[PDB]
Amino acid sequence: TVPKLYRSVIEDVINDVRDIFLDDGVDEQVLMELKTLWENKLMGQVEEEPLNSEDDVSDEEGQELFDTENVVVCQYDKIHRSKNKWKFHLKDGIMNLNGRDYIFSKAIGDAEW
């Protein structure tokens, strides 16, 4: 199922860029080579000024530096939180779980912070 969507995306992509390739004056043969390579790659403190009285008041700061874990890209229609829990109302989006690609239209999520 997922591969069929990818092929349809390719068909839309090539059609969408046909006018651009004609406009910029580049030969259409470039597009044919582009798809070939594209397919191959995929498959008492009185003085308070100093703040040093407290140390190690933060966790690891490299969580966003790596980004090697699964990443979810989506669009949000409403996100509200009531004193304990974050409720996610996210519409159509894509996900990359353990390499596998997942696509959803409507999703609902509840989380605790």
Partner: protein
């Protein structure tokens, strides 16, 4: 000059890598690669909003969240994805949202 969401993905990475390979061969100017990426982003955005009609659910624990430029960066831990047909378990996930 667009939303530019799916660029940092396996699909986006492969397209960027392919464009770089052509550039190294002097087959495409850098401007053409940018135009292709912009067209690709428009095509995928329209495709997802149209050809995706499946509903899913998930639960988990939130560890970190951010919001800047109307972009959420939720970081969830121990997330269980529940679907009518399948269930998935993931230790950590980063959610990037826009609107």
């Amino acid at each position: 000059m667009a939303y530019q969401l799916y660029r940092n993905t396996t699909l986006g990475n492969s397209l960027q890598e392919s464009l770089d390979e052509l550039i190294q061969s002097q087959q495409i100017t850098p401007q053409l690669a940018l135009q292709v990426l912009l067209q690709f982003d428009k095509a995928i955005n329209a495709a997802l909003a149209q050809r995706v009609r499946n509903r899913v659910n998930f639960r988990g624990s939130l560890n970190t969240y951010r919001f800047c430029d109307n972009v959420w960066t939720f970081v969830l831990n121990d997330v269980e994805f529940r679907e009518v047909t399948e269930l998935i378990k993931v230790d950590k996930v980063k959610i990037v949202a826009c609107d």
